[PDB]
Amino acid sequence: GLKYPALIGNLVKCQVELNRKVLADLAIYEPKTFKSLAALASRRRHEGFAAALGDGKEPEGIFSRVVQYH
């Protein structure tokens, strides 16, 4: 119940870098893993939409907020 562009965008918007080969392998031999990934992608999409609509103040998405590095 998702699309490839939005799914890839939501997966990239979570610091969860995963190539396409591993994604296909999981979808083939691990339906539950891909289901959880799709759920996380939909949650990130909804959080981003809510943020763009209300500009946050001050949730900033429980799943968003990338981990900074130095």
Binding site: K32, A39, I62
Partner: protein, 82 residues
């Protein structure tokens, strides 16, 4: 109460997060098939090629044989995988 996807097949959906926010965790328990969602077990060339095609819903081209060239080109000792 929120649910990003309908938990009515394959497994449920429960996205989790650690206190440090560095690793994501999930809990996808498999869904069991209910008891009321089941049912009780109840208790010559041309014509032959056409019948086979109608039975297998395939075309009438692959049914015919091939020459010895393709027969010999076929590998009888394929690589055993798994």
């Amino acid at each position: 109460t929120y649910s990003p996807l309908p938990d009515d097949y394959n497994c449920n959906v429960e996205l989790a997060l650690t206190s440090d926010g560095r690793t994501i965790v999930c809990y996808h328990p498999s869904v069991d098939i209910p008891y009321e969602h089941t049912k009780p077990i109840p208790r010559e060339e041309g014509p032959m090629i056409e019948q086979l095609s109608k039975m297998f819903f395939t075309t009438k081209h692959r049914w015919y044989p091939h020459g010895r060239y393709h027969r010999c080109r076929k590998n009888l000792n394929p690589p055993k995988d798994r």
